[PDB]
Amino acid sequence: MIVMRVKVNEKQFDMIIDKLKLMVYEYNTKIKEYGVYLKPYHIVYKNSKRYIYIGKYWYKLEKIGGWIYLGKTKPIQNMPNPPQIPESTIIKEDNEYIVDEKILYDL
Amino acid sequence: VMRVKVNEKQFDMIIDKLKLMVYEYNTKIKEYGVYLKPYHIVYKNSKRYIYIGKYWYKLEKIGGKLKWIYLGKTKPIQNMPNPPQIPESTIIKEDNEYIVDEKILYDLE
């Protein structure tokens, strides 16, 4: 398959995240009694870049300290089946700045 | 060739040189309760504006939290030592960009 990777801005990225949050709002309040939460994405900083993975990422209610991440496998067998979430990777581009050349005299 | 594009690392270079330019001046004027921050970040028009110039602040006790209050762009007190020459310029942070699969773009409306 020829899979297309294209460039989008922050606002277009925001709608992508918002849509995923909308698609799992139907699931999380229903399964809130199980102490489990389904996050449709995962943000991780590798290779000096912000990686935003898309998928099924689960959480479990904490006990005491001083919501824990369970990974990608569903915890409870007798929980209702989650909605279908697509799997993809988003890589944030390096930040760019419009700069006057004069103030580059700090060399 | 006035205005060009630099990425994050060179942007952090310019920020640090300004902070170093005022570090020893700020230590001298610490007793006055006055801080010269050599830049000003404005999030106007959904974009990170960073303005190069003199920005003076001062310290006071507001409810016990010791909050910084903006003073202006000039020396608040006549008998303070003169500041370093901070240039005047504007830096615009470009809109954040992302590489995304086109399928989830179509499949997420």
Residue numbers in the entry:
A (entry chain C): 1 to 66, 70 to 110
B (entry chain A): 3 to 111
What is written in the article reporting this PDB entry?
UBP is a highly abundant protein, and we reveal that it plays a role akin to bacterial nucleoid-associated proteins with over 300 binding sites on the Sulfolobus chromosome. Importantly, UBP interacts with the N-terminal domains of MCM. Taken together, our data provide evidence that UBP functions as a general nucleoid-associated protein that plays a key role in facilitating the egress of the MCM replicative helicase from DNA replication origins.
We additionally solved a second structure of UBP from crystals that had a distinct space group (P21). Interestingly, these crystals, which were twinned, had four dimers of UBP in the asymmetric unit.
